[PDB]
Amino acid sequence: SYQVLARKWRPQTFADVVGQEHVLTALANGLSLGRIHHAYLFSGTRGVGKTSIARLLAKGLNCETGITATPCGVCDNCREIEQGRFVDLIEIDAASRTKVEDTRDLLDNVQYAPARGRFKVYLIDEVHMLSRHSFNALLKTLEEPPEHVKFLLATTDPQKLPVTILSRCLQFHLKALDVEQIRHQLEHILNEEHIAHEPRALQLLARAAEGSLRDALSLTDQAIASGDGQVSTQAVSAMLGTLDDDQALSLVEAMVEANGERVMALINEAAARGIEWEALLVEMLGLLHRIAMVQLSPAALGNDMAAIELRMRELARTIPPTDIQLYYQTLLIGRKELPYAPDRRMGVEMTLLRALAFHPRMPL
Amino acid sequence: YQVLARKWRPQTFADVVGQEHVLTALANGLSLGRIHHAYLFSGTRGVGKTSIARLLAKGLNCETGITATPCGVCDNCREIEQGRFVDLIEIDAASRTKVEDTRDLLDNVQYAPARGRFKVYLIDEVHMLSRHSFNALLKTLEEPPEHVKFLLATTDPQKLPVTILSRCLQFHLKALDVEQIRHQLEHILNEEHIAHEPRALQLLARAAEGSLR
Amino acid sequence: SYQVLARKWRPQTFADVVGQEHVLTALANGLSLGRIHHAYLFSGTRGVGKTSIARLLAKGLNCETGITATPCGVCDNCREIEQGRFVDLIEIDAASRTKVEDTRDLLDNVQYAPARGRFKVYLIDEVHMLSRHSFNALLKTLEEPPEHVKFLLATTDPQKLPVTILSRCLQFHLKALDVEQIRHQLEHILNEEHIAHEPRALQLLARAAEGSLR
Amino acid sequence: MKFTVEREHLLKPLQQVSGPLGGRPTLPILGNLLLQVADGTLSLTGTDLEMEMVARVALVQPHEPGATTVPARKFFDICRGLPEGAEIAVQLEGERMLVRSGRSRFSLSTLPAADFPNLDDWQSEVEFTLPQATMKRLIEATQFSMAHQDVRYYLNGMLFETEGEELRTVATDGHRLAVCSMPIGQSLPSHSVIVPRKGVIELMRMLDGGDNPLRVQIGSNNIRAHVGDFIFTSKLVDGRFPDYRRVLPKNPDKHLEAGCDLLKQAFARAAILSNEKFRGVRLYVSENQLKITANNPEQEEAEEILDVTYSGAEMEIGFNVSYVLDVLNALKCENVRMMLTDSVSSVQIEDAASQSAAYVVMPMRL
Amino acid sequence: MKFTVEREHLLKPLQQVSGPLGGRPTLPILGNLLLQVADGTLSLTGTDLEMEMVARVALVQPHEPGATTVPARKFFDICRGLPEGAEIAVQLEGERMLVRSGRSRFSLSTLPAADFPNLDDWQSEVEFTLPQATMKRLIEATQFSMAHQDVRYYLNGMLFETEGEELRTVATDGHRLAVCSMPIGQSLPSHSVIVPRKGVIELMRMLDGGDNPLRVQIGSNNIRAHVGDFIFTSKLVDGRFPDYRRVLPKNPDKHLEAGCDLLKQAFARAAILSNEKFRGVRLYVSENQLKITANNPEQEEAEEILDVTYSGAEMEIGFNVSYVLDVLNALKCENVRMMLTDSVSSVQIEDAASQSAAYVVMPMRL
Amino acid sequence: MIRLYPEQLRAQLNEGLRAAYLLLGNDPLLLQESQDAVRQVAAAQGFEEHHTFSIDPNTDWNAIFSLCQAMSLFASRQTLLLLLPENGPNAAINEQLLTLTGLLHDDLLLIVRGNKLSKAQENAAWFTALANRSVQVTCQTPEQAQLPRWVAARAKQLNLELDDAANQVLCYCYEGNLLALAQALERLSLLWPDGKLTLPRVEQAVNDAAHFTPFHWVDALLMGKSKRALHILQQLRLEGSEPVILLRTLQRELLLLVNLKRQSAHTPLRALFDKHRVWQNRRGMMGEALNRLSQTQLRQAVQLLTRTELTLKQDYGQSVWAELEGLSLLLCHKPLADVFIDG
DNA sequence: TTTTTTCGATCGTATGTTGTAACTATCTC
DNA sequence: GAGATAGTTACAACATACGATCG
Ligand SMILES: Nc1ncnc2c1ncn2[C@@H]1O[C@H](COP(=O)(O)OP(=O)(O)O)[C@@H](O)[C@H]1O
Ligand SMILES: Nc1ncnc2c1ncn2[C@@H]1O[C@H](COP(=O)(O)OP(=O)(O)O)[C@@H](O)[C@H]1O
Ligand SMILES: Nc1ncnc2c1ncn2[C@@H]1O[C@H](COP(=O)(O)OP(=O)(O)O)[C@@H](O)[C@H]1O
Ligand code: ALF
Ligand code: ALF
Ligand code: ALF
Ligand SMILES: [Mg+2]
Ligand SMILES: [Mg+2]
Ligand SMILES: [Mg+2]
Ligand SMILES: [Zn+2]
Ligand SMILES: [Zn+2]
Ligand SMILES: [Zn+2]
């Protein structure tokens, strides 16, 4: 069995959380000083620790010793909260329960005093899926909240909530986990699990994670399965190559340096999986246009292309503008002529060959 | 009489053509005992996503035990072959795209399997589910019961939310080459006792692109 | 009351069609050898006989005498199919039934056995007008239909269908009719109708037809 | 217009007229019923542009001829709220109507009577009269089998066929068929018509078990029913209805006899753990034995076994339990005969004592 | 777990236990009934994390101790559908429950009994036994005045107060108030609690009018009720209930006495044409005369006049007819006494001969 | 009707309490603060009952009318709150509000929240009925020019010290979103009890959550700030704005500039501005635009805009944002070699 | 002191209003 | 005390408003 790494390694303490200092420090100071707000909201990308931090805060609020930022983890309340059997902690999957009738019964329990806890904690996750009537009921409940109830909200789309709901809760935004922290966490987990590994494999997995720890753990599990109980550089590289889906940028880089063999290999790899050739041409045209814009002004490239920022910057810095314009025009002509080519693959190959070796002759 | 596509569906891991990496990973996972709870299969049409999913279900639910080489002769294997196995719940997401169906399905996930050791949900064409349906599966998929496994197959993976993708192990099947298709056609025709010529088989293989169907 | 030549002279036997020899030979061989598929698609230009051949195949499948490539044309099933009021032959106009709800309702009733004929035939016309959801809903049942149902599809724009649908059915392409064939058919029809004509008029009409008999 | 009338004599006609009127008329005039007084009679009329109901009440008090339109709901509520034995005096003044009675006064609004729609006259091709009980039995034997909102517009009504010395009612929805026949005692020309479901419901509500014979007139595309002081007029679907003779199985070779109550209870118990969407059950027939099995998506299984009169070969079939339960409820007999041929053919159900009514149900390939 | 019982001995307790359950529960386990067999006793438990119902049945046949959880509606339907007088044998095999009755077999899915929530024990503070009739009278008198959905939670329940040898029930919603009180014959310490709506509903349902006394225990935050072999436990709402004594008028100078049935009929007739949106009526009171008037935006007016026993000065006052009709329906007596001071002050309604129950209604701005 | 700003609302409430309060604006923070102050003052005066409703086509006005008409046994002094639609009231809403204003009582305190009303909305029967007994508080988000003063004052009232660099960073990161900025100040105060907020300290706990409108993008294009224009365009794309709105907003100003450039050859600019009804404040920026773009330009821009419109309309293309970025760079003085203009 | 948008066809979710069927309590013989 | 009638509760169908995707 061995369980799953994502489930097994849930952070059970504030010290186990990776990064997110600007949130944990504020929460600890608030708990120590007694400055506790009525409603908390957590936002961020996938797999950054919103639910983990919410559960840790809920555990800290209702600990036997007292309101502290360092829960003991041994009293009955801590164990029940960890196992998910605590009576005074109500966890609501708003995605599964969206209708007003379902939410009304849950929200009507605020009229009963807590059974065995200082506070009655409601942890509503995926709260952006609620309907308008559910939002109205939640707002009415939050207008006059009893002094012994707290609301914790977690979502990835805070813009979907009404402004009235947002204005009555304190919002914390979580950040990406960065490559170094992800690599360190993976190394620690593998060392605890007694699994052989190499630095290069860990670096590749961390880079492919793209700021999400759950993605990193899933990739690590897949690599362990592929490597037959071991994590090796060759196995991880092969696995990533299998899932690689950025043939457009690689094709652009190969074409710009006039390397026909690499272009043919990339075309074969793209054809190995099911891809739309016109989509590939559109992606290449978009990449060339973005490179031209970046050459015009460095601010053109934004945070949406953070994954391939370095390669785009290098291409913009190295390639002269005239070559970029020539390639863009050649690809435009190729896209225009694609429908009448003998085949889509043949059309793409002919256009890439023309870009590699040939130059059109313009009138006059 | 019976259509070749339906008649010659693989029933053992040895009958699968190509897809070496996926089969090796699945076999290693089954042998070591490290079994996930959410698998996603991607690829072009007619490459064997459903076949591999059914083979994995057979391996999980075989009477002999959790093995990478299902016997293919016990009651569970035969029932899975005939599509009459109670614990293999096959959902056609293309038809049931509404959130009400998803809620009904989720309301009965904690009940134990009738006869097998695992309850396997095989959702086909999962890319056609509605946004509410996708968001309703997040928590159950993240932390399912011990005796529940989810298998997902689609040809358009990019339409799924990133949150769904982060919760499952992804396997991308690759299109088959001419040589493998020609060899499979030769084997099938030899088993069927039908005369053939090499050039005809080469033409058929080239005209089929990379899909066996 | 009065019926135009196009409606009156719809072929009612495999020997009454013009051209399309390869399709007819393939269908006859398949019926004779007993190898019957569960999904047929017909493609071609306009007015080449896709619907006619589909109806002929449906009539041959459900004939009382048996599964034959030469329907008798005299039993009750053949007459009812010719009149277009046969219970087990369900004809769908996809150009006006594009809604996915209609497709789901149709698929929910495939479990019921046929009333009179040995097969329940679905003839979907203008299938290229269905929505994406309709195609995706069809896919699963089209892959593995029950043993007592058949699907016949006719279209003029096969490019619009998804590759998944095309992969699940046997495709027959109908060539555009030649000038000589159209001229001969017109001459035969006029002779049967007792109408005076001249060779040059027939030649001009056939040339202006541009490969379409309708 | 001015007239005084007893409350009791006016209660029932008001309810009968207001029956056909719907909750949402979409037109103010439609929501109001037409009230006329002429000579020595008071006529209440209610229509919805598809159906028409007319009731007449005798007048013994002095009155003046007139016509108007009044809301059905408010007038009916006012009349019903008054104490028993009260006399209602209705008078028209300008655009208002005084309904003074005892110490209570009301001022109902009115609209012009000329705006009330009317139905064009038609020629009655066939006319006959039958007892109320026969019509009630005919309608009840086949009402439940009518399609609710099927795409076929002609399957939403009941088929009435007058032939020889008998009248026949047929109902179907594409998967089940119900046929009933009853003698009328008078020879009539062969004729077939289709009546919409709303007309059938109104006709059923009209019947009260009285001894007054009910008179039926049928034209090209209209039907009229007369009973007592009540007249009802409706249109016809004028559609193509399948022949029931084709649907009936031909020379079935397997016969089964069972008790209605025990079989109904067994089917009801089995239906509890059946699929909610499809409601499918499996029947196994063997020598003097019937077994019913049901399964649901949760894999909960229900099994029932009973003893019947059967001597044929063993057989297995599938069915929709809802249709069987409806047929058994409709029969209300002591014994039931089921006729079958094979697992892929339809099954006929009839009463052992009488063959007046028959039902046909097709199987499912579970 | 194995046991055998009779249909009659299990039909009613199962219905009582499964009545509260419905809809889609917060957790699947909450949708099931907990069955426990121990020391020749079968215990059926049903909870929804707010209130709990427990029933007990005696076993006089061989059995095996155990515990499990089963679906409520499915099991109840299966038990009810069996023939009267049948014997039901229940057994547990693996993760399934088998129910056998004659030749009928049913298989049901179950969940572990360890996951079923159980309410923690608490110590009662007040205990008293009273007849079911008194509690039923109090509830039926004071239930209709509770608020439906208000931000102030304490108004959604009912206030139960023990004072000396008297038990009092009070309800209100900010616009109307109902108070009733009855003796119990025993001295109890002064106490007050608030019962939620669902608790009151269940307490009303569990009463059957029998001679078995009802025993009530009240603690810090919970209330328990014993009736025969049925136990009902509920939680109490936290908050402060408004004091009803200040609501009652200090000195109502004007008094009136009117027939209950005649006044109710007059109010109903007036409300038949009252503005549906507002449901407002206007009362003119003069020497031995009471006139009720209503109107609607369409310039249609309804008027009625009746006689009363009044001797004060003429006055006009507006009211919401719904509250008056509810109060009149609550009071089933030959005569009703109304006490009032002016048109902008609350009106008291009581029975002519009985002082146990009183109602206070606030006039509407008109 | 009295007119006020959020700072004077507390002074007015101390002076006295009126019958109706209107809160109109686009800033959630100021609206919430005004509502809280009004409700606190009312509760001090003895208003312990509050009701809230949302104005929409599916609204139950019967409940509101019953609440207004009915009395209370003990809990008097009711407060009613209405939330107008984003678009604004329509004729049906106008007559409903007129009816509600007709049924107004001294013990009922009315509050209304919504976006700023236009002249057509202002000229309504219900609006004029409350003119003699109403006070309107205008809650508009300050522009970038006045933002740093607001940030400094808000930090001052919280007993915090902000450096100039920290203030600039806060203004840049939370422009147009005052709720987020206030919450950021609260979180910074929580993090550092000493209250010393330096640049490195603030830079750690700040994220980009700015909010913009197409008019800001057009103004940035007119000024000629490529970085600001690109940032605004990226924020608008993230929000999910409709490209057609941006296209029309740019088209109006671009056509005006083309006409002015063509007709300014033999006419002073002041006369042209007067004839074209140019607002006095904008006349500055427009001027410099005419000194930065030649007649050769403003034709390539028009061609690119027309091509983008055609692609959006008939081709249903997805590269509209790339063309918008190219046009934004074109309006600023950049080469823009014209291979991408198809000229 | 303002300046705010392309259209047609199809699919999915949530709420309010009206009508029908089954079961229970009450009324009449 | 049983059958018939009236009242209540639950489920289904129809109509309206709002949000999202692809051509
Ligand atoms: N900051 C973190 N530190 C340690 N582990 C983390 C962190 N964030 C996420 N994880 C890992 O990712 C898994 C899923 O995180 P989850 O609670 O789903 O976050 P979110 O709610 O943002 O999706 C957890 O099991 C946890 O081990
Ligand atoms: N890898 C494979 N090996 C053998 N047969 C295959 C393979 N892939 C596809 N097929 C054939 O194609 C048919 C359809 O495959 P299918 O299960 O529909 O795959 P997908 O789910 O990817 O469409 C099968 O009946 C099988 O005979
Ligand atoms: N192969 C053919 N042989 C004889 N007649 C034909 C043929 N194809 C078309 N026709 C004539 O054209 C008319 C319409 O053909 P139709 O069935 O609509 O073809 P399609 O479905 O391709 O449009 C028919 O009535 C028939 O008379
Ligand atoms: F559970 Al998440 F982002 F996937 F909070
Ligand atoms: F069944 Al497929 F792609 F056609 F998985
Ligand atoms: F061209 Al056609 F039916 F008229 F295919
Ligand atoms: Mg989470
Ligand atoms: Mg498949
Ligand atoms: Mg055709
Ligand atoms: Zn602890
Ligand atoms: Zn096996
Ligand atoms: Zn034939």
Domain limits of chain D?
1-123, 124-247, 248-364
Same domain, F3 and F105: yes
Is F123 within the bounds of a domain? yes
Task: Give me the long-range contacts of B61-67 (CB less than 8 A, separation at least 24).
Answer: B61/B85, B61/B87, B61/B88, B61/B116, B61/B117, B61/B118, B61/B120, B66/B30, B66/B33, B66/B35, B66/B117, B67/B30, B67/B31
Six token digits for residue D153: 């517009």
Residue from D243, D233, D282 nearest D163 by CA: D243
Is F88 within the bounds of a domain? yes
Supply the Cα-derived Rg of chain B in whole angstroms.
18
Same domain, F124 and F169: no
Strand H-proximal residues of E, range 51-70, CB below 7 A, are: none
Six token digits for residue F77: 């002094």
**Closest residue in chain F to residue A157, using alpha carbons only:** F239
- The secondary structure of D224-248 as a DSSP string is EEEETTEEEEEE--------HHHHS
Put residue D224 in one of left, alpha, beta given phi > 0 → left and psi -120 to 50 → alpha. beta
Same domain, F63 and F197: no
Six token digits for residue D27: 């037109």
Ligand 4 site residues (CB inside 6 A) read A 46-47, 50-51, 154, 156; B 163
* CA angle at F271 for the pair F268 and F275, rounded to the nearest 5°: 140
Put residue E181 in one of left, alpha, beta given phi > 0 → left and psi -120 to 50 → alpha. beta
Chains that touch C (3 or more CB pairs under 8 A): B, D
Instruction: Find all residues with CB under 8 Å of D361, minimum gap 6, and list them.
Output: D175, D176, D177, D319, D320, D323, D324, D327, D346, D347, D349
Range D315-337 burial, b when 16+ CB lie within 10 A, else e: bebbbbbbbbbbbbebbebeebb
Is F61 within the bounds of a domain? yes
**Cβ distance E13 to E7 under 8 Å?**
no
| Residue nearest G16 (alpha carbon to C1') | F58
DSSP B108: T
Alpha helices in chain E (DSSP H): 7-18, 72-81, 132-142, 197-206, 260-272, 321-330
Contact check, Cβ <8 Å, B111/D297: no
**Cβ distance A285 to F326 under 8 Å?**
no
Is F108 within the bounds of a domain? yes
Range F170-202 burial, b when 16+ CB lie within 10 A, else e: bbebbbbbbbbbbbbbebbbbbbeeeebeeeeb
Q: Is E310 annotated as a binding residue?
A: no
CA atom of B134 to C1′ atom of G14, Å: 18
> Which of F112, F142, F172 finishes a domain?
F142
**Cβ distance A116 to A77 under 8 Å?**
yes
Q: Which ligand is nearest to the CA of C49?
A: 3
CA atom of D161 to C1′ atom of H14, Å: 33
**This structure's resolution (angstroms)?**
2.6
- Answer positive or negative: Cα dihedral of A221, A226, A231, A235: negative
**Ligand 4: centre distance to CA A124 (Å):** 12
Report the 10 Å Cβ neighbour count for E175: 20
Query: Does residue A202's CB lie within 6 angstroms of at least one atom of ligand 1?
Result: no
Query: Which residues from chain F sit within 8 angstroms of residue A35, using beta carbons?
Result: 190
Half-sphere exposure of E55 (CA within 13 A, CB side): 18
Is D237 exposed, middle or buried, given 0-12, 13-18 or 19+ CB atoms closer than 10 A? buried
Residue from D131, D127, D118 nearest D224 by CA: D127
**Cβ distance C58 to C90 under 8 Å?**
no
Supply the Cα-derived Rg of chain D in whole angstroms.
26
3-state secondary structure chain A: CCCCHHHHCCCCCHHHCCCCHHHHHHHHHHHHHCCCCCEEEEECCCCCCHHHHHHHHHHHHCCCCCCCCCCCCCCHHHHHHHHCCCCCEEEEECCCCCCHHHHHHHHHHHHCCCCCCCCEEEEEECHHHCCHHHHHHHHHHHHCCCCCEEEEEECCCHHHCCHHHHCCCEEEECCCCCHHHHHHHHHHHHHHHCCCCCHHHHHHHHHHHCCCHHHHHHHHHHHHHHHCCCCCHHHHHHHHHHHCCCHHHHHHHHHHCCCHHHHHHHHHHHHHCCCCHHHHHHHHHHHHHHHHHHHHCHHHCCHHHCCCHHHHHHHHHHCCHHHHHHHHHHHHHHHHHHHHCCCHHHHHHHHHHHHHHCCCCCCC
d(CA E359, CA E347): 8
- Angle between helices A233-243 and A213-227 in degrees, nearest 10: 120
**Cβ distance C212 to C48 under 8 Å?**
yes
Instruction: Find all residues with CB under 8 Å of D42, minimum gap 6, and list them.
Output: D3, D5, D10, D35, D36, D56, D57, D58, D59
Same domain, F284 and F178: no
Residue from E196, E198, E214, E130 nearest E158 by CA: E196
Six token digits for residue F236: 């608008």
Is F342 within the bounds of a domain? no
Six token digits for residue F275: 């004839």
d(CA E80, CA E207): 22
Instruction: Find all residues with CB under 8 Å of E333, minimum gap 6, and list them.
Output: E260, E351, E352, E353, E354
Same domain, F53 and F96: yes
Instruction: Find all residues with CB under 8 Å of C127, minimum gap 6, and list them.
Output: C94, C153, C154, C155, C161
Range B147-168 burial, b when 16+ CB lie within 10 A, else e: bbbbbbbbbebeebeebbebbb
Mutate to test the pocket of ligand 2, among B7, B80, B213 (most ligand atoms within 8 A of CB): B213
Instruction: Find all residues with CB under 8 Å of F127, minimum gap 6, and list them.
Output: F117, F121
Instruction: Find all residues with CB under 8 Å of E276, minimum gap 6, and list them.
Output: E296
**Cβ distance E201 to E207 under 8 Å?**
no
Half-sphere exposure of C74 (CA within 13 A, CB side): 2
Maximal CA-CA distance, chain F: 79
Six token digits for residue F2: 């009295």
The nucleotide closest to E22 (CA, C1' atoms): H10
Give chain E's contact residues with A (Cβ, < 8 Å). Answer: 23-24, 26, 49-50, 117, 120, 151, 153, 156, 196, 221, 235, 237-239
Is A233 exposed, middle or buried, given 0-12, 13-18 or 19+ CB atoms closer than 10 A? middle
Report the 10 Å Cβ neighbour count for A364: 2
Chains that touch F (3 or more CB pairs under 8 A): A, E
Instruction: Find all residues with CB under 8 Å of C147, minimum gap 6, and list them.
Output: none
Look up residue D286 and give its amino acid.
Answer: S
Mutate to test the pocket of ligand 4, among A46, A91, A175, A215 (most ligand atoms within 8 A of CB): A46
**Cβ distance E352 to E336 under 8 Å?**
yes
d(CA D116, CA D277): 46
- H-run or E-run covering F232: helix F226-239
Six token digits for residue D25: 């008329």
Look at strands D104-109 and D176-196 and give their pairing: unpaired
**Cβ distance D321 to D302 under 8 Å?**
no
Residues, CB < 7 Å to strand G: A 98-101, 131-134; B 97-100, 130, 132-133; C 98-101, 131, 133-134; D 22-24, 201; F 58, 118, 213-215, 242-245, 248-249, 252, 279-282, 312-313, 316
Q: Is A215 on the interface with B (CB under 8 A)?
A: yes
Q: Is E20 on the interface with F (CB under 8 A)?
A: no
- The yes-or-no reply on B/A contact (3 CB pairs or more, < 8 Å) is yes
Nucleotides of G under 7 A from a protein CB: 1-6, 9-20
d(CA B73, CA D336): 46
Range D193-224 burial, b when 16+ CB lie within 10 A, else e: bbbbbbbbebbeebeeeeeeebebbbbeebbb
Query: Does residue A17's CB lie within 6 angstroms of at least one atom of ligand 1?
Result: yes
CA atom of F250 to C1′ atom of G1, Å: 22
End-to-end CA distance of chain F: 58
Ligand 4 atom 4, closest CA: A46
**Cβ distance B51 to B16 under 8 Å?**
yes
Distances (CA, A) of F12 to E210, F37, F45, F131: 66, 11, 14, 17
**Cβ distance C144 to B6 under 8 Å?**
yes
Helices (H) and strands (E) in chain F, counts: 17, 8
Class of domain E124-247: alpha beta
* CA angle at C174 for the pair C168 and C175, rounded to the nearest 5°: 145
Range A184-198 burial, b when 16+ CB lie within 10 A, else e: ebbeebbeeeeeebe
Range F18-45 burial, b when 16+ CB lie within 10 A, else e: bbbbbbbbebbbbbbbbbebbbebbeee
Domain count of chain F? 3
Residue from A262, A234, A235, A232 nearest A249 by CA: A262
Six token digits for residue A191: 């060392």
Rounded to an integer, what is the distance from CA F48 to the centroid of its chain?
Answer: 33
Instruction: Find all residues with CB under 8 Å of F223, minimum gap 6, and list them.
Output: F285, F288
Closest atom of ligand 2 to B43 CA is: 22
Query: Which residues from chain F sit within 8 angstroms of residue A21, using beta carbons?
Result: 204
CA atom of F319 to C1′ atom of H22, Å: 16
The nucleotide closest to A160 (CA, C1' atoms): H19
Return the C-alpha torsion angle C51, C56, C60, C65, nearest 10.
140
Instruction: Kindly indicate whether the domain formed by D248-364 is annotated with CATH number 3.10.150.10.
Output: yes
Six token digits for residue E10: 């299990």
d(CA F291, CA F301): 16
- H-run or E-run covering C125: strand C120-125
CA atom of F62 to C1′ atom of H3, Å: 45
**Ligand 3: centre distance to CA C50 (Å):** 7
- Answer positive or negative: Cα dihedral of F85, F87, F93, F98: positive
- The secondary structure of E180-241 as a DSSP string is EEEEEEEEEEEEEEEE-HHHHHHHHHH----SSPEEEEEESSEEEEEETTEEEEEE---S-P
Contact check, Cβ <8 Å, E278/F72: no
Q: Is B72 annotated as a binding residue?
A: no
d(CA F204, CA F163): 15
3-state secondary structure C24-90: HHHHHHHHHHCCCCCEEEEEECCCCCHHHHHHHHHHHHCCCCCCCCCCCCCCHHHHHHHHCCCCCEE
A362 φ/ψ angles, rounded to the nearest 5 degrees? -95, 155
SS3 of chain D: helix, strand, coil, percent, to 5? 20, 45, 35
Instruction: Find all residues with CB under 8 Å of E281, minimum gap 6, and list them.
Output: E267, E270, E271, E274, E292, E293, E294, E318, E319, E320, E321, E324
**Cβ distance E304 to E321 under 8 Å?**
no
Six token digits for residue C23: 């399709």
**Cβ distance A212 to A48 under 8 Å?**
yes
Six token digits for residue D262: 């025990």
Distances (CA, A) of F15 to E162, F12, F41, F105, F108: 49, 5, 11, 21, 19
d(CA A111, CA E241): 13
Report the 10 Å Cβ neighbour count for A229: 13
- The secondary structure of F88-156 as a DSSP string is ---HHHHHHHHHHHHS--TTEEEEEEESPP-HHHHSSHHHHHTGGGEEEEEE----TTTHHHHHHHHHH
D242 φ/ψ angles, rounded to the nearest 5 degrees? -60, 145
Report the 10 Å Cβ neighbour count for E19: 16
Look-up: residue for tokens 């039908």?
B194
Is F334 within the bounds of a domain? no
Contact check, Cβ <8 Å, C111/D366: yes
Give the number of residues written for chain D: 366
Return the C-alpha torsion angle D140, D145, D150, D153, nearest 10.
-50
| Residue nearest H13 (alpha carbon to C1') | D149
Same domain, F138 and F12: yes
- The secondary structure of B33-90 as a DSSP string is T---SEEEEE-STTSSHHHHHHHHHHHHH-SS-S-SS--S-SHHHHHHHHT--TTEEE
Helix (H, G, I), strand (E, B) or coil at F19: coil
Six token digits for residue D28: 């103010």
Is F77 within the bounds of a domain? yes
CATH number of the domain to which F289 belongs: 1.20.272.10
Contact check, Cβ <8 Å, C113/D366: no
d(CA C20, CA C13): 13
Distances (CA, A) of A60 to A41, A154, C167, F204: 17, 17, 58, 25
Instruction: Kindly indicate whether the domain formed by D1-123 is annotated with CATH number 3.10.150.10.
Output: yes
Same domain, F85 and F101: yes
Q: Is E131 on the interface with F (CB under 8 A)?
A: no
Helix (H, G, I), strand (E, B) or coil at F239: helix
- H-run or E-run covering D108: strand D104-109
d(CA B19, CA F175): 53
- H-run or E-run covering C134: helix C132-143
d(CA D195, CA D121): 19
d(CA B97, CA A349): 40
Contact check, Cβ <8 Å, E151/A105: no
Report the 10 Å Cβ neighbour count for F315: 9
d(CA C20, CA C43): 12
**Cβ distance B151 to B42 under 8 Å?**
no
Same domain, F14 and F74: yes
| Residues of the domain holding F71 | 1-142
